Amino acid sequence: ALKRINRELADLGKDPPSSSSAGPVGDDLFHWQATIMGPADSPYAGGVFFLSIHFPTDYPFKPPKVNFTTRIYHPNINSNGSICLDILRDQWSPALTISKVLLSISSLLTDPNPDDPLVPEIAHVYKTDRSRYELSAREWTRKYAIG
């Protein structure tokens, strides 16, 4: 696990992710903290979201545990930060890098999926009253994502 984790870390160093920045906590390779910037064409524009990544002892043969730390008002992200992403539960394969996961999370942020939601109330607001959803997401990103 250590070899592949260091390969991914070096590759992140070798290529500026621009929209993201992940790295180990202190000196522990099995606990990363990553940052995601809210897309400009999104209600979360100008927001910094922190994620915690926990690599299992069996990496890359088990998915990393990725959880949002910043509060976000999204149909597919609940109050605990759990992310409704398929590549993190049962579609994980030992060929996906952390950069791919971060790109997937950014794509999830730029457009939600209310037809298979994790938070039914936010999904209902999104489907019926879009403007209220926009205002709520803007308020949440101004209150929690900016500080």
Binding site: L2, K3, P24, D28, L29, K62, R89, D90, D115
Partner: protein
């Protein structure tokens, strides 16, 4: 009326109807030597109605080579008489008897007849009777490193289950007018041509819902065809299909007819020319015995081999066999005629016992009809095997010396093995080692470790443990039992109660591991297997791995500097469902069972842990307020479980259970249907509640309903257990208390600054001070599947079935709920016997120190279909480092406890490589991209000092080495892989 407290793991393999039919069948076993006693033991553990033994031959010393129910005090006594006493203790529901005289007409009392150690004329006489009276007949034979099985279940045998798999089922997306059934998105049906399926809940084609099975014509991994459904309708939408398994008729031939034209089962496709040779060879053995007053050829005797080969030629000519006889192989069969190996006995006994169960239950596909096996690659080549060394010495190892010799016996007696695990495979392995004479010499030793204790369900396949042993340590009992079997093992077995893992490296350290000869894994999880594999790789010890599941099993061997390790390959991982599916949109009973388990944890475990940690840690709230995802949830849990909803009696527990019923089965469903009404549509105009999403409906509490009452009882009982109150089971109190309940009104909510911190503070200070509560704790509920009086499986079953009723899913029972929630692994005694036999056949290869990789075999088998297969191990990959050949697995660098700068300089000067990353354990000791100040601080430190500083944890006194991972780049910048570093402290 099956005792599920004993047959728990076996019922998940066979079933209830199978075992009910099995408990009405009589089994006669002729012959009470190692093979016969193995078969009888497995049959007694399986649970047949009764077992009768017939063996009036007085005991001989050599019989102790594989008969573990015989002692040296039993010489001269008939084997059945001395074996029945010890067989009668294995299972209390299976009587075991002995008959001193066998007549043909007496055979009609038995469902199955097993024949061992019998001449061919007697076998023909018995089979001529059993064939015309429709009695299952099995004949087994074990000659040295050779084995044979023959099955004859009658001309009209009926097999109800052929492969032992669960019926296939799946959700349909559409059915066209021509029967083209299509699965959902990216879903595989898994059917094969000729299978039968039945449909339910098919909209637009009600005719398919009648329940008539239909033929399947597979057209791809996602679609199949059923024929013409023109009359039933034009097109069908949604629905589910379930496979229908149809009985088969199998016709067997008698032994007399089967001798002339046999039908072979091939255990290995690498040697497909041999079974025809063994067919002639075993008949020649019978003829030789008949011509010499029942005496087999003497070990490694050339005159007897010549006479035996003449018999083989005569038989091959008589049977019109058009096969050219391989003289070397046939004479090898002659040489090892008197061999009696406990490994071959275990392997064949497991196979034959499974065949007996097939005969008595009409389940799984039986062998058709001859099964000839050999393990001739196990014959030693590093010692002298001749007539002088293989002659009997009048000891209990004569049956093994007749195959391997006395020098190999001296090699075996000096082994220093390490057995990890003492379960079923561990018990079988210990018994095999005791019979083989392992570690009975002056320099031999056995170490066995296991941290578990004996339970009732373990007695069904771990034959070394008795009901009186329940509650004791597995390793101590196993060591005592095997010391009883072989008295020479007294004082040469050491038992530990330690779990093998990172926390036990002070006991199983360098000194412990450097004296071993081999390690055998008998575990049930992959984490421990990987840990032991890494330890064996570091210490360069041979490893024997084995695993079972139901009727399937595998064995692998890891040899230093020759093969790859256990962790070099991948296995399919456990399947976990999406959180969205579990929380809101279940469609299978597995989803609801997972939800029920999470509900159990969230109701009876987590809040209690939070309350207890609040009353212990003085700074719990301050840390939790900033180091938790939902500190508000923790505060609410503490408040509710301490002050707001603390029960002072059991009636308050009943009211709490009623409230939780309303919360989890009536109100959340109403909120969900408020968010997504049943008439809602997706963003593309399709209905929302279609296909994998099933529209739920709220439940109204009715006391007369069984599931509602079960949930209330279990929830109230578990709450009382949490608060230490006295629960009750009489329905009268429940009906009295619940009658006067007024549910608070509920209306789903439509939704619509920094003061919340003040609210959290107000909640926190409202809690009673920890100082006022000293010595007060709440008992948490720790999940326990095997106890049927703690209300755990009862609660999980009730919650799962209620949530299934919410979504119109078919509820399950406590049996399946316990299977799913408990993550139980189906287990069988026959599979354990087979894997132990294979492992002990590879062990003698390890002892001989064979170097070539084609001499070792990894084995796989499935006894439900009668499949055996073997393959050579994979050689460890090689690589080029600095123009030198390096093994990628078994090679390492050995360096002193130098400084980081000196290590980097050594790698630069010696290997010509530039170090870029250096890590130890779970820490990054050095990286090329770190700031110059940190490096300049960390360079002049020794590796041990650097590790201690970075981990902030001093190395233990017993720690004698460090393992370091290093990533380095060459001069050109190309990344080159290198083996790990072993720093000597």
């Amino acid at each position: 009326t099956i005792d599920e407290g004993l047959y728990s793991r076996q019922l998940y393999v066979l079933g209830h109807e199978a075992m009910k039919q099995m408990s009405q069948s009589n089994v006669l076993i002729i012959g009470c030597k190692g093979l016969g006693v193995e078969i009888a033991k497995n049959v007694c553990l399986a649970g047949v109605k009764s077992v009768t033994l017939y063996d009036p031959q007085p005991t001989r010393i050599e019989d102790l080579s594989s008969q573990y129910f015989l002692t040296e005090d039993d010489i001269g006594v008939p084997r059945a008489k001395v074996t029945v006493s010890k067989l009668a203790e294995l299972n209390q529901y299976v009587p075991v008897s002995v008959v001193d005289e066998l007549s043909t007409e007496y055979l009609k009392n038995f469902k199955c007849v097993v024949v061992t150690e019998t001449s061919l004329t007697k076998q023909l006489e018995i089979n001529d009777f059993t064939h015309k009276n429709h009695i299952a007949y099995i004949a087994a034979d074990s000659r040295g490193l050779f084995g044979s099985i023959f099955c004859d279940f009658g001309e009209n045998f009926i097999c109800t289950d052929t492969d032992g798999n669960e019926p296939l089922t799946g959700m349909i997306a559409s059915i066209t007018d021509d029967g083209v059934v299509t699965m959902l998105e990216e879903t595989r049906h898994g059917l094969e041509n000729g299978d039968f399926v039945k449909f339910t809940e098919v909209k637009g084609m009600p005719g398919l819902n009648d329940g008539t099975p239909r033929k399947v014509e597979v057209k791809g991994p996602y679609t199949f065809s059923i024929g013409s459904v023109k009359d039933l309708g034009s097109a069908g939408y949604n629905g589910v299909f379930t496979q229908v398994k149809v009985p088969t008729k199998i016709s067997f031939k008698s032994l007399r007819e089967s001798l002339k034209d046999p039908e072979y089962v091939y255990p290995d496709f690498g040697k497909m020319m041999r079974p025809p040779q063994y067919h002639i060879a075993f008949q020649a053995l019978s003829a030789f015995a008949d011509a010499h007053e029942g005496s087999l050829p003497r070990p490694r005797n050339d005159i007897d081999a010549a006479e035996f080969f003449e018999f083989c030629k005569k038989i091959a000519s008589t049977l019109q066999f058009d096969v050219e006889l391989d003289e070397k192989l046939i004479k090898e069969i002659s040489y090892q005629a008197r061999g009696d190996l406990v490994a071959m006995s275990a392997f064949l006994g497991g196979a034959v016992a499974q065949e007996v169960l097939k005969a008595t239950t009409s389940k799984f596909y039986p062998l058709k009809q001859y099964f000839y096996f050999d393990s001739l690659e196990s014959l030693p080549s590093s010692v002298t095997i001749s007539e002088e060394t293989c002659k009997p010495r009048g000891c209990r190892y004569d049956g093994q010396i007749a195959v391997f010799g006395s020098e190999f016996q001296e090699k075996i007696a000096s082994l220093s093995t390490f057995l990890v695990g003492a379960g079923a495979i561990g018990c079988e392995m210990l018994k095999n080692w005791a019979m083989m004479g392992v570690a009975t010499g002056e320099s031999g030793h056995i170490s066995v470790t296991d941290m578990d204790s004996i339970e009732k369900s373990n007695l069904n396949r771990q034959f070394l443990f008795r009901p009186r042993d329940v509650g004791k340590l597995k390793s101590e009992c196993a060591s005592t039992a095997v010391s009883i079997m072989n008295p020479s093992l007294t004082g040469k077995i050491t038992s530990y109660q330690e779990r093998v893992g990172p926390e036990s490296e002070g006991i199983f350290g360098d000194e412990f591991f450097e004296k071993l000869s081999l390690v055998t894994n008998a575990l049930d999880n992959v984490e421990a297997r990987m840990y032991v594999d890494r330890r064996c790789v570091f210490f360069e010890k041979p490893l024997l791995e084995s695993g079972t599941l139901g009727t399937k099993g595998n064995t692998q061997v890891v040899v230093p500097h020759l093969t790859e390790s256990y962790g070099s390959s991948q296995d399919p991982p456990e399947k976990s469902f999406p959180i969205c599916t579990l929380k809101n949109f279940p469609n299978r009973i597995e989803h609801t069972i997972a939800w029920a388990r999470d509900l159990f944890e969230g109701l009876f475990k987590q809040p209690i842990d939070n309350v207890n940690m609040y009353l212990s840690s003085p700074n719990f709230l301050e840390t939790s307020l900033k180091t938790s995802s939902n500190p508000r949830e923790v505060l609410e849990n503490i408040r509710d479980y301490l002050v707001t909803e603390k029960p002072l009696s059991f009636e308050e527990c009943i009211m709490w259970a009623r409230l939780q019923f309303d919360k989890f089965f009536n109100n959340n469903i109403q909120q969900l249907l408020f968010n997504f009404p049943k008439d809602s549509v997706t963003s593309t105009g399709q209905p929302f509640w279609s296909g994998p999403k099933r529209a739920p409906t709220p439940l109204s509490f009715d006391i007369h309903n069984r599931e509602h009452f079960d949930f209330i009882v279990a929830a109230a009982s578990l709450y009382a257990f949490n608060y230490g109150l006295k629960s009750e089971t009489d329905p009268a109190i429940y009906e009295r208390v619940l009658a006067g309940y007024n549910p608070p009104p509920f209306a789903p909510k439509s939704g619509i600054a920094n003061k919340d911190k003040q609210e959290l503070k107000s909640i926190a200070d409202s809690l009673p001070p920890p100082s006022s509560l000293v010595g007060f704790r709440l008992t948490p509920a720790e999940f326990e599947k095997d106890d049927d009086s703690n209300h755990h499986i009862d609660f999980i079953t009730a919650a799962s079935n209620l949530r299934a009723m919410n979504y119109d899913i078919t509820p399950a029972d406590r049996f399946k709920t316990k299977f799913v929630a408990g993550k139980i692994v189906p287990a069988m005694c026959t599979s354990t016997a087979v894997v132990s036999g294979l492992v002990c056949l590879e062990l003698v290869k390890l002892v001989d120190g064979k170097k070539k990789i084609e001499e070792y075999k990894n084995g796989f088998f499935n006894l439900a279909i009668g499949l055996f297969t073997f393959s050579d191990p994979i050689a460890s990959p090689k690589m080029k480092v600095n123009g030198k050949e390096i093994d990628k697995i078994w090679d390492r660098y050995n360096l002193p406890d130098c400084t980081l700068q000196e290590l980097i300089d050594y790698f630069q000067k010696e290997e010509g490589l530039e170090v870029t990353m250096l890590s130890s354990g779970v820490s990054l000791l050095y990286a090329n991209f770190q700031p110059p100040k940190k490096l300049a601080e960390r360079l002049p430190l020794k590796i041990s000092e650097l590790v201690e500083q970075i981990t902030k944890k001093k190395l233990e006194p017993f720690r004698k080495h460090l393992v370091l991972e290093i990533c380095c780049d060459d001069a050109n910048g190309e990344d080159v892989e290198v083996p790990f570093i072993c720093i000597k402290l």
